[PDB]
Amino acid sequence: SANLPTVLVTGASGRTGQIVYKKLKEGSDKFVAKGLVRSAQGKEKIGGEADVFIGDITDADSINPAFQGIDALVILTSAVPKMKPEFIFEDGQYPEQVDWIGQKNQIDAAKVAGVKHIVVVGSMGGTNPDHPLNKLGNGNILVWKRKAEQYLADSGTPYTIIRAGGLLDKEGGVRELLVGKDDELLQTDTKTVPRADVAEVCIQALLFEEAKNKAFDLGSKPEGTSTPTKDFKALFSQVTSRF
Numbered sequence: 488s489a490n491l492p493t494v495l496v497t498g499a500s501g502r503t504g505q506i507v508y509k510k511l512k513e514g515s516d517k518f519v520a521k522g523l524v525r526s527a528q529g530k531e532k533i534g535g536e537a538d539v540f541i542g543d544i545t546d547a548d549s550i551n552p553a554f555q556g557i558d559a560l561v562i563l564t565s566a567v568p569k570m571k572p573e574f575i576f577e578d579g580q581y582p583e584q585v586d587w588i589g590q591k592n593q594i595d596a597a598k599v600a601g602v603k604h605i606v607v608v609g610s611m612g613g614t615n616p617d618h619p620l621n622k623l624g625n626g627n628i629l630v631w632k633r634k635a636e637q638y639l640a641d642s643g644t645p646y647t648i649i650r651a652g653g654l655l656d657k658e659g660g661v662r663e664l665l666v667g668k669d670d671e672l673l674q675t676d677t678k679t680v681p682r683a684d685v686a687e688v689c690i691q692a693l694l695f696e697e698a699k700n701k702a703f704d705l706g707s708k709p710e711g712t713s714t715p716t717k718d719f720k721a722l723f724s725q726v727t728s729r730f
């Protein structure tokens with residue numbers, strides 16, 4: 488409902504996705520949490536609870552049930568490279584299918600259900616088509632994720648696109664978070680961010696109107712070189728880019 492949003496997080500058994508899922512449950516006062524995962528193993532990993540759905544984002548009908556009644560969507564799905572030390576994408580699970588098409592299906596499902604807000608987590612690197620990450624498993628992962636991002640900006644639904652720096656497994660809430668445009672943070676040594684702060688930014692974007700129709704790159708300052716971001720109003724306000 489307008490005042491108690493049902494928020495679906497997809498890739499909810501993912502590393503960032505599961506922090507988003509728990510934070511929607513921990514604070515299941517301001518939100519009703521709902522998770523989408525790819526397998527029964529993923530669903531059990533996260534508590535196996537009733538608000539978790541199983542589906543394949545490359546099969547639009549298999550994910551449609553999860554979208555019923557939702558108010559917001561946080562997309563935390565990604566094509567994931569597999570190792571045979573050389574990396575490859577499983578068949579029909581390339582960034583084209585998973586990140587472009589897989590996300591297209593979420594976005595289309597969400598418009599149907601009348602979602603007020605879709606948040607998507609992506610990656611820095613998308614202003615440069617020759618970026619090293621695109622070579623990984625011959626995928627063009629950043630190209631396809633950008634396509635999904637542009638498709639989301641295009642759809643008419645209020646959106647927040649979060650292009651994270653290198654993901655860290657470090658404590659959330661303890662860093663100054665930095666917000667950039669067009670990969671500019673990649674010139675710095677502040678171009679990486681804990682998974683738990685990306686998760687926090689997804690949830691915060693839900694709470695502030697200043698986050699709607701914004702696209703930014705997300706980095707952080709090392710813990711101890713500044714005061715932790717506590718004021719997300721100010722943070723979102725410094726963004727002016729729509730893409």
Ligand SMILES: NC(=O)c1ccc[n+]([C@@H]2O[C@H](COP(=O)([O-])OP(=O)(O)OC[C@H]3O[C@@H](n4cnc5c(N)ncnc54)[C@H](OP(=O)(O)O)[C@@H]3O)[C@@H](O)[C@H]2O)c1
Pocket residue numbers: 497498499500501502503504524525526529542543544545563564565566567585589608609610611650651652653654655682
């Ligand atoms: N790794 C980095 O340092 C880096 C840097 C910048 C940005 N990012 C971006 O940040 C985001 C979050 O990263 P993360 O490492 O926390 O994510 P992650 O652990 O790799 O999780 C991605 C999730 O997507 C799910 N998924 C993949 N294909 C699916 C499909 N066929 N149907 C349903 N679910 C599917 C995976 O399911 P399973 O559990 O079943 O595998 C997984 O749970 C990603 O978009 C990533 O591109 C990553």
